[PDB]
Design a binder for this molecule. Structure first.
Ligand SMILES: [Ca+2]
Ligand SMILES: [Ca+2]
Ligand SMILES: [Ca+2]
Ligand SMILES: [Ca+2]
Ligand SMILES: [Ca+2]
Ligand SMILES: [Ca+2]
Ligand SMILES: [Ca+2]
Ligand SMILES: [Ca+2]
Ligand SMILES: [Ca+2]
Ligand SMILES: [Cl-]
Ligand SMILES: [Cl-]
Ligand SMILES: [Cl-]
Ligand SMILES: [Cl-]
Ligand SMILES: [Cl-]
Ligand SMILES: [Cl-]
Ligand SMILES: [Cl-]
Ligand SMILES: [Cl-]
Ligand SMILES: [Cl-]
Ligand SMILES: [Cl-]
Ligand SMILES: [Cl-]
Ligand SMILES: [Cl-]
Ligand SMILES: [Cl-]
Ligand SMILES: [Cl-]
Ligand SMILES: [Cl-]
Ligand SMILES: [Cl-]
Ligand SMILES: [Cl-]
Ligand SMILES: [Cl-]
Ligand SMILES: [Cl-]
Ligand SMILES: [Cl-]
Ligand SMILES: [Cl-]
Ligand SMILES: [Cl-]
Ligand SMILES: [Cl-]
Ligand SMILES: [Cl-]
Ligand SMILES: [Cl-]
Ligand code: NA
Ligand code: NA
Ligand code: NA
Ligand code: NA
Ligand code: NA
Ligand code: NA
Lengths: 132, 132, 132
């Protein structure tokens, strides 16, 4: 399913979280874009999406987004990244998915821990994409 | 007048200020670029400009600039951002303006305070543009 | 030989180094790209390259790379940047070179010192390119 490079920074004193969708590579040619959903517990509270890159298994997005965090910490916040193939005339297929959050299974888990442990530091990591 | 997303980082021990013009959105189609002027008190001491994005109310610029700061603090330094419409054959019109500095009125004010309070941290914020 | 703007951040607790190739200017028109080699002592342990920008003495690359550092510090690590002209049908010529490392001669030297002195801070600097 490929890999996705993302950078996040938690502005702890101002309750914002900045998320940069940097690049994807080794995607399963597709016309990728990335959708970013922000959840508070299980409720989606915000969504963003990048521009689409045409016909390529590797795509530089470089898109920074700013999220408002409606609570005093990231404990119940999670971020969902969806790499989708833009296709006219049909529903866009999910190429891969990545979740970061306090209970996220590994990759996503450690990156989120670091984000919470180091507020105000932008941290970037490559993650393997899962089925979505 | 739209909005402009910018990130700044004050390298206090080396007297440089890095300014990233990230994106504009909801611009009043125009062919936007952004000009960045740096002032020490009321004297312009440096200027930069981005490339132009063609025919669009939303534009990803992603342009980082490095400014030399000729004094030991940011107390008398201010940064002026101008979103302009590139038009051949006439003076380019100012679509909107944003000022950050110690006496700047609100948005620009708080972002600058944070920049001075947190040297070496890159901080990004959306700002409403004013008439210019 | 022109100049190259690069930003680096040493994630000291996780042994990764993030390197952003931002822009080149005043290049000697060429079709520039940048190759980035990582050395541990004198052995190349990783390599990356940007996309190429066509026919221009100034080029925005904005490419972030993540390097694994196989040791506990940056003492014996160095990073080599090569600005090359992409040319079909012949070996691509090196337009300029830049080295950052503990024993690097000046520019590269001070930027690397700052990188080691300020782990987790992304630091950006313009450097003059040398013959390569
Ligand atoms: Ca808190
Ligand atoms: Ca498609
Ligand atoms: Ca599926
Ligand atoms: Ca000072
Ligand atoms: Ca125009
Ligand atoms: Ca006006
Ligand atoms: Ca160490
Ligand atoms: Ca060429
Ligand atoms: Ca040579
Ligand atoms: Cl790889
Ligand atoms: Cl979607
Ligand atoms: Cl969705
Ligand atoms: Cl929503
Ligand atoms: Cl939706
Ligand atoms: Cl945003
Ligand atoms: Cl937290
Ligand atoms: Cl990584
Ligand atoms: Cl909006
Ligand atoms: Cl202008
Ligand atoms: Cl002006
Ligand atoms: Cl000037
Ligand atoms: Cl001028
Ligand atoms: Cl970009
Ligand atoms: Cl600059
Ligand atoms: Cl200050
Ligand atoms: Cl904001
Ligand atoms: Cl110059
Ligand atoms: Cl090469
Ligand atoms: Cl090489
Ligand atoms: Cl290698
Ligand atoms: Cl090689
Ligand atoms: Cl990489
Ligand atoms: Cl070190
Ligand atoms: Cl510099
Ligand atoms: Na939000
Ligand atoms: Na579709
Ligand atoms: Na300057
Ligand atoms: Na004009
Ligand atoms: Na590596
Ligand atoms: Na060649």
């Amino acid at each position: 399913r490929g890999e996705l490079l993302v950078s996040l920074c938690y502005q702890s004193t101002t309750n914002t979280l900045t998320v940069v969708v940097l690049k994807a590579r080794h995607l399963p040619l597709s016309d990728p874009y990335v959708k970013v959903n922000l959840y508070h517990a299980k409720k989606r509270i915000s969504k963003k999406k990048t521009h689409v890159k045409k016909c390529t298994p590797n795509a530089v997005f470089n898109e920074l987004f700013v999220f408002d965090i409606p609570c005093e910490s990231l404990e119940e916040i999670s971020v969902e990244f969806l790499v989708l193939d833009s296709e006219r005339g049909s529903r866009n297929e999910v190429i891969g998915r990545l979740v970061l959050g306090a209970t996220a299974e590994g990759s996503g888990g450690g990156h989120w821990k670091e984000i919470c442990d180091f507020p105000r530091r932008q941290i970037a990591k490559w993650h393997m994409l899962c089925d979505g």
